[PDB]
């Protein structure tokens, strides 16, 4: 019925009201101290007071660092902006990597704004232009004003549009009998479509038919909008939305990332602080998650050192499988987790421990129940021994071939023969490497 | 089309119990890998399991891409199969992660149901009112069937589709309302007044009867990547063919994901998953491997099959060596299908299948010589020798291919080992690794 | 391989014949366009569609020009002026093409050799989008 992925079974951190961690709840098994530390970090984010706080999730492969990051994102809720990222994603061919890191920093900071929109909506009854007396002067246009009549439910009024607003009208291909929607904030026009007051069975352009809009024309409506600081930065860097020719030609150009200057970011911060001071918008700081932080080179770490000291930077969480490894882009800088000690000093390392046999067994059981599979107890024990022998991920990813082989033989349960056949058909990394070492023609 | 190297593979050759036949649908041998590929195919056809990494490993000339093409042939239609190599990711206009994201989203299909009105009938009258510059176009179309006759209002696009493939009165045409398709079925009037302008010789079509408007439901599949490219900018439909989709932002991807979830919850659209096949996966960088590791854990992630033919080799972008050229965290997320070499009988059956596909008649002793050559040197070498032996036999003005044609083709075209021996015996005649050569005879 | 059926030649007259009871509120409602084409040893009077007439205004076709019409599409093509119609003896920038040979009505089978990359290049770019 429902499509499942690697982290579908996790609903959150699963903590008590005192911050302690129940052993098996919230889709989580084990990692009690790591879940408690992540809950403390979640409460720090919900305080909405600090800037540039950075922690590091450190542990081996298949230990649940990305699981903890997804649990943090689920416990924070959909309102808090969560920006998942890989260390390899910052290498862009359009713009420098530091600009991409700053763009993700601004993308992780959110804003909730109440916006008042002045709206002229209604069905077009008459649309008559008034021509200019000298059409070919080269300084004005062919028309001077346009009279347009709009009727809503229990209301009718006429508008005298300048040629810019009429240009926005006629680019939507507005004719007589169209319910339209003019937004006075930007001059943007939405053509809602044909009115149902006329015949609706004689068109060929699969149009929708709408009733007359309720209320009067020229309404003022309040909309709650959730944006980010990066949305404002990319809207002001590439201006679209006005009816001037720069906005309209910039609509049609191919979009391309640019190095957004500090002046534009400071001006956007000033406008956002003015929105907050009038009490019309609220700031929601969020989380930037960087999995495989070992992929960053020394320049991104150096820029991270400066960017974490900003007064608007979000909470940045990182993950790494590395031990004592050289930093990328360097030669001899051996560092823990592939992260240089200048950034490690700004970090709070959260350790993540490996699992036991019974924890692996109940993780396999929960992944089987979230995938709607029935496994026998002996087959579950063999899956647990296979997980302790080869890998946890190999035992989790062998459940679906076991289900395929079970439904092939017209069974709902997964017998020991099914998991033996799936072990024979599909190989882990260690058995494949043992085949590689004992082969001649480079298997 | 033409005969390629995998044209004989028309599927996987498996029963309803996922058991491979010894020779079926152009596939012979490799029973365990074929059974594992059938399990993978059933997992794809279930559609409820997302983001699983599958690695196909083995020596060269064994059947990894043959198994992938068998999966693709058994996959069925309206299911995506994005077969790329590891060298397409390295681009000048796209990042490695962005190219990998586009390859991931090309493999996820969306089946959309649309409601369509079909209007087939004879045209009574076309009235087209156009502006002085020809920009604004409107008008009416009086159309008719043998029961009733209606008048429709025409838009700009319908008039533009009426001007091309010029519809006169008395023409039986079909109107597809949901797609804006104008199909001139023909002419039914055959008026005596004939103009000297047109060279149209439209066939006579009988007058359509019944109702004029017929409601129907159409079903079409559009990939995810098409939806992000279309919604990314204004002229995204041009960028679907030019490929000028430079680094689509993540906001577009998030909004497209929420919109397609809303389309799934409305019953308008459904999401079908497909297979992303990556041939020569050892060519990817370590950054690509890390991005694949984190992108496999997505809801909109397809089944990823990878093929490599390398042992413990150097991983690109690093300074160490890893099994299959892939790091251990990627191999932790993958289940490895192992493909083994062939014996004499499997090579003989493959060569017989390839000769039957290429319309080449072989004798028994010629097939035995080709099997012995394929065992000794390479299966691909004998499969390439089949066609030139057929050309030699047709040059000798005989229909079938004899032993001496295969021997002549073996003498004319060299394999790897014979060329290596000829180069090593004549080392001074060739440019070495130090750029030294003796061109002069004396 | 394809079939091209064309009428080309120096033109002799351009009479946009008006219709009987020609509606109201419009000037010169055209019932059909009569075009008199001539070439070597051939001369044909053609009764064209009215909607070719604006194409007559589009390519600036006057009496004495050498024009070229495909039968299937009905699009005119002003090749140039006739060599005999070099009336402006002193100064003119017209391209005076010779009068075309053979009959006016010619239907010929032509063969075009392209590559698949040519088709990919021609299909990639917007074919006559007519936008900015």
């Amino acid at each position: 019925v429902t499509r499942t992925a690697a982290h579908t079974h996790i609903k959150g951190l699963g903590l008590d009201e005192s911050g302690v961690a129940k052993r098996v709840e919230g889709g989580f098994v084990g990692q009690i101290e790591a879940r408690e530390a992540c809950g403390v970090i979640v409460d720090l984010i919900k305080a909405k007071k600090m800037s540039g706080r950075a922690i590091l999730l450190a542990g081996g492969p298949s230990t649940g660092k990305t699981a903890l990051a997804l649990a943090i994102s689920q416990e924070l809720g959909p309102k808090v902006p969560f920006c998942p990222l890989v260390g390899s994603e910052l290498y862009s061919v359009e713009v420098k990597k530091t600009e991409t890191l700053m763009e993700n920093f601004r993308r992780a900071i959110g804003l909730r704004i109440k916006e008042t929109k002045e709206v002229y909506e209604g069905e077009v009854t008459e649309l008559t232009p008034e021509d200019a007396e000298n059409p070919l002067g080269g300084y004005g246009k062919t028309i001077s004003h346009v009279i347009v009549g709009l009727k809503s439910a229990k209301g009718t009024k006429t508008l005298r549009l300048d040629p810019t607003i009429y240009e926005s009208i006629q680019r939507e291909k507005v004719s007589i009998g169209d319910v339209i929607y003019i937004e006075a904030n930007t001059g943007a026009v939405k053509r809602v479509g044909r009115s149902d007051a006329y015949a609706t069975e004689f068109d060929l352009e699969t149009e929708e038919y709408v009733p007359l809009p309720k209320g009067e024309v020229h309404k003022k409506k309040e909309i709650v909008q959730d944006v980010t600081l990066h949305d404002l930065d990319v809207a002001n860097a590439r201006p679209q939305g006005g009816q001037d020719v720069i906005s309209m030609m910039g609509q049609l150009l191919k979009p391309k990332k640019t190095e957004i200057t500090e002046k534009l970011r400071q001006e956007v911060n000033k406008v956002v602080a003015k929105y907050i001071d009038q009490g019309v918008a609220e700031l929601i700081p969020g989380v930037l998650f960087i999995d495989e932080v070992n992929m960053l080179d020394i320049e991104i770490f150096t820029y991270l050192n400066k960017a974490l000291e900003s007064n608007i930077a979000p909470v940045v969480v990182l993950a790494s499988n590395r031990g004592m490894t050289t930093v990328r882009g360097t030669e001899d800088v051996i560092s823990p987790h592939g992260v240089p000690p200048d950034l490690i000093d700004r970090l709070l390392i959260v350790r993540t421990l490996p699992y036991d046999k019974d924890e692996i067994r109940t993780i396999i059981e929960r992944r089987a129940t979230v995938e709607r599979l029935q496994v026998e107890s002996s087959a579950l024990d063999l899956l647990a021994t296979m997980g302790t022998e080869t890998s946890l991920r190999y035992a989790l990813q062998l459940l679906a071939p076991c289900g395929i082989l079970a439904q092939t033989s017209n069974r709902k349960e997964i017998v020991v023969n099914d998991v033996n056949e799936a072990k024979l058909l599909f190989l882990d990394a260690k058995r494949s490497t043992k085949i590689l070492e004992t082969s001649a023609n480079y298997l | 089309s033409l005969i390629a190297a995998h044209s004989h593979i028309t599927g996987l050759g498996l029963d309803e119990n996922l058991q491979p036949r010894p020779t079926s649908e152009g596939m012979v041998g490799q029973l365990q890998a074929r059974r594992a590929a059938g399990v993978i195919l059933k997992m794809v056809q279930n559609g409820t399991i997302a983001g699983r990494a599958v690695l196909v490993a083995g020596p060269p000339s064994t059947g990894k891409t043959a198994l992938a093409m068998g999966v693709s042939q058994s996959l069925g239609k309206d299911v995506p199969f994005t077969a790329i190599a590891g060298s397409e990711i390295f681009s000048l206009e796209l990042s490695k992660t962005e190219a990998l994201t586009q390859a991931f989203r090309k493999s996820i299909g969306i089946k959309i149901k649309e409601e369509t009105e079909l209007i087939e009938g004879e045209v009574v009258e076309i009235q087209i009112d156009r502006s002085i510059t020809g920009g604004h176009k409107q008008g009416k179309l009086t159309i008719k069937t043998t029961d009733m006759e209606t008048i429709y209002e025409l838009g700009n696009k319908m008039i533009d589709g009426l001007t091309k493939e010029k519809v006169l009165a008395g023409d039986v045409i079909s109107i597809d309302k949901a797609s804006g398709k104008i199909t001139k079925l023909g002419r039914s009037f055959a008026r005596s007044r004939d103009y000297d302008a047109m060279g149209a010789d439209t066939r006579f079509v009988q007058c359509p009867e019944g109702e004029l408007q017929k409601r129907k439901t159409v079903v079409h599949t559009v990939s995810l990547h098409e939806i992000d490219v279309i919604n990314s900018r204004t002229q995204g439909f041009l960028a679907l063919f030019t490929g000028d989709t430079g680094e689509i932002r993540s906001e577009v991807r998030d909004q497209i994901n929420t919109k397609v979830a809303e389309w799934k919850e409305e019953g308008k659209a459904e999401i079908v998953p497909g297979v992303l096949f990556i041939d020569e996966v050892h060519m990817l960088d370590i950054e690509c491997f890390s991005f694949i590791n984190r992108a496999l854990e997505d809801e909109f992630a397809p089944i990823v099959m990878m093929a490599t033919n390398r042992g413990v080799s150097k991983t690109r972008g690093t300074n160490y060596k890893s099994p299959h050229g892939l790091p251990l965290d990627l191999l932790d997320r993958s289940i490895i299908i192992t493909t083994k070499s062939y014996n004499e009988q499997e090579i003989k059956t493959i060569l017989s299948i390839r000769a039957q596909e290429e319309e080449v008649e072989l004798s028994s002793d010629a097939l035995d010589l080709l099997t012995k050559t394929g065992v000794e040197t390479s299966l691909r070498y004998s499969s390439n020798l089949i066609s030139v032996a057929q050309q030699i036999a047709m040059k000798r003005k005989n229909n079938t291919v004899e032993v001496e044609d295969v021997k002549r083709a073996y003498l004319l075209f060299l394999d790897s080992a014979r060329s290596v021996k000829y180069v090593q015996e004549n080392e001074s005649q060739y440019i070495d690794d130090q750029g030294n050569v003796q061109i002069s005879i004396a | 391989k394809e079939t091209k059926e064309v009428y080309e030649g120096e033109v002799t007259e351009l009479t946009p014949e008006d219709a009987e009871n020609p509606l109201g509120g419009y000037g010169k409602t055209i019932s059909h366009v009569i075009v008199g084409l001539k070439s070597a040893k051939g001369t044909k009077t053609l009764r064209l569609d009215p909607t070719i007439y604006e194409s007559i205004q589009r390519e600036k076709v006057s009496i004495g020009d050498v024009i070229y019409i495909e039968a299937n599409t009905g699009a005119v093509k002003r090749v140039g002026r006739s060599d005999a119609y070099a009336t402006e003896f002193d100064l003119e920038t017209e391209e005076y093409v010779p009068l075309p040979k053979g009959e006016v009505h010619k239907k010929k089978e032509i063969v075009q050799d392209v590559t698949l990359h040519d088709l990919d290049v021609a299909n990639a770019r917007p074919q006559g989008g007519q936008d900015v």
Binding site: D196 | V123, V124, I132 | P22, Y26, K28
Partner: peptide
Amino acid sequence: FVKPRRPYNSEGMTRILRRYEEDLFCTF
């Protein structure tokens, strides 16, 4: 009852009328 047709305004626009017998191009 029956809903009325949408008002069709074609003032100042050239007309191309294709009928069973003759075709007309009412231009300006």
